[PDB]
Amino acid sequence: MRRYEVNIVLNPNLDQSQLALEKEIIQRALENYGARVEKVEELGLRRLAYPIAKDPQGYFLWYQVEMPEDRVNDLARELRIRDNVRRVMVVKSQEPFLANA
């Protein structure tokens, strides 16, 4: 069971309740699928470089997680049945290759 990065872009028009409702709906799914959570980074509001679902912006989640490889598809499948879930992009974690010094 390996280490991944879950990206979620959320609807940018949510009050603390609808917003943190989604999040707990997410933490739920995540647990339910086998994912313990290393680091996190809620960067929330960012201005999209092109309109996603008609909206000039999007709300950015970012978990780092370990989970069972065979569930990773099945999680992100589910993770995105929501409407305020606009992108799910789950990526195998990676040594940070660099340039310049």
Partner: protein
């Protein structure tokens, strides 16, 4: 010209969220710049093209822009 590698210090070119760096690698039409211009190596540019594309799907980078003043 200048080389887009010569403008920076250490950056993780696998980091698909760093728009401020990643963005300096696109044209004004927002297209992945050639190595002629980026001054990266083959190996590096291979990993860049991969990360930019990711950024794109995430909504953090353009696929195209309109050229200004043609």
């Amino acid at each position: 010209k200048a080389k887009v590698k010569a403008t920076l210090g250490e950056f993780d070119l696998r980091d698909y969220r760093n728009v401020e760096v990643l963005k300096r690698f696109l044209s004004e039409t927002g297209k992945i710049l050639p190595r002629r211009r980026t001054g990266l190596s083959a190996k590096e540019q291979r990993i860049l093209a991969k990360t930019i594309k990711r950024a794109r799907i995430l909504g953090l980078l353009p696929f195209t822009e309109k050229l200004v003043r043609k």
